[PDB]
């Protein structure tokens, strides 16, 4: 997983911690 380029939408949200 990568917060800069999360392949999975779920990862982006988790990494974004909004």
Rounded Cα gap, residues 11 and 1, in angstroms? 7
| Lookup result for tokens 């990568």 | 2
Rounded Cα gap, residues 16 and 10, in angstroms? 10
| Lookup result for tokens 């939408």 | 9
Torsion 16-11-9-13 (CA) sign: negative
Q: What kind of experiment solved this structure?
A: NMR
Instruction: Reduce the DSSP state of residue 18 to 3 states and report it.
Output: coil
């Amino acid at each position: 997983c990568n917060c800069k380029a999360p392949e999975t939408a779920l990862c982006a949200r988790r990494c974004q911690q909004h």
